[PDB]
Amino acid sequence: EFSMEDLIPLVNRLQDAFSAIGQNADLDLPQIAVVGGQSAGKSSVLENFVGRDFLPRGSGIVTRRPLVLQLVNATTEYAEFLHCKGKKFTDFEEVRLEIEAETDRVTGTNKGISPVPINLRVYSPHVLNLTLVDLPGMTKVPVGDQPPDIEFQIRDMLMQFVTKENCLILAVSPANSDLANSDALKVAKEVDPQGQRTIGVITKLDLMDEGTDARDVLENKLLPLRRGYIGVVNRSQKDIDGKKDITAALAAERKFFLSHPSYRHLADRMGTPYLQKVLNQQLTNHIRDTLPGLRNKLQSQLLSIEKEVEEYSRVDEMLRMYHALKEALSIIGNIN
């Protein structure tokens, strides 16, 4: 009867301890990271997991730092950032502003990026028990005052997440561009050739040119993926501006698939609700099969933290990682 719930007690502690001191890139915990070109609609897809407006979204470069989003099912609903402990947020608009402010603090407002992640934990009776990673979208040419190698700084940042064995890759591609043009799929095939942990998501289906559709892609025929593709339709910029809510966006999406002559026959396997259901199941299957591997990785990190203790505030930080790992090992050893 294994589920993500069983991992919650250990994931929670480990994330605090490691990400707190900039070592987030050490743990190989189960998570789902979003990859794709700039403005493909990645943050819009992730935001739906919470059901509230809280992630900065928009055309042009908006997400500029990774966001490690820990979702925990709980009776009450509130959010907390690792960078400002003690402060609990109930207003999701204020959560959005803090992500924007924390991003600007480090990356400025002249379009730069930073691989330092913002860690946010959200407790809600409506969410699944998953960790999502929002990431800046891949680009080809620098604009404004971005550095000349911005494309590679962005790729490097994403690679650090997606090369991990327990990271499910959500390869996001916009319907209004040929799939052959997909930066998400190129990246995904490079790190996960067999497609064992890659899921395709086609966004912006409502923006396709008249007389065309993505049926061949959605039926998994154009470029087959082991895990298939799921189509979604999120809010346009006009919608965001006009304050259309998620409940209304979801209804428009359901109607879109049921009434589109190219997709009606696939409607049951399309949409945001379906994507979230499938992602949860896929992550559950992945970790169920890789639990021994996770235990062995934590055993390795523990061996590593021990050696580091003897080499020596920084002591407190290391001890917190040490105890979280010891506890994680005990908890995981009891999971079947």
Residue 65 Cα distances to 106, 133, 212, 314, angstroms: 9, 10, 35, 25
> Is 130 near ligand ALF (CB under 6 A)?
no
The footprint of Na ion on this chain (CB under 5 A) covers a number of residues equal to 2
Instruction: Give the range of 32-40, 252-260, 313-321, 325-333 binding its own copies by CB under 8 A.
Output: 32-40
- 331 contributes a contact to ligand GDP by CB under 6 A: no
237 annotated as ligand-binding: yes
Considering CB distances under 5 to 8 angstroms, the limit depending on partner class, which of Na ion, ligand ALF, its own copies, none binds residue 120?
A: none
Mask of contacts with ligand GDP, 58-97, x by CB under 6 A?
xx--xx----------------------------------
Phi, psi of 171, rounded to the nearest 5 degrees: -85, 100
Distance CA 26, CA 314 (A): 17
Closest by CA position to 307, among listed 297, 316, 298, 318: 318
Q: 158 with 113: CB under 8 angstroms?
A: no
- Between strands 31-35 and 167-174, the pairing is parallel
Per the annotation, does 204 bind a ligand? Answer: yes
Amino acid making up residue 199: I
Among 20, 25, 62, 74, interactor with ligand ALF by CB under 6 A: 62
**Binding-residue pattern over the window 234 to 253 for its own copies, x denoting contact by CB under 8 A:** --xxxxxx------------
Residue number with CB closer to Mg ion (63 or 182): 63
Please identify, among the stretches 34-42, 96-104, 145-153, 220-228, the one whose residues bind Na ion according to the rule CB under 5 A: 34-42
Instruction: State yes or no: 58 annotated in a binding site.
Output: yes
Q: Is residue 320 packed enough to be buried (19+ CB in 10 Å), middle (13-18) or exposed (0-12)?
A: middle
Q: Give the 3-state secondary structure percentages of the chain, helix then strand then coil, rounded to 5.
A: 50, 15, 40
- The binding site for GDP consists of 39, 41-44, 57-58, 204, 206, 209, 234-235, 237
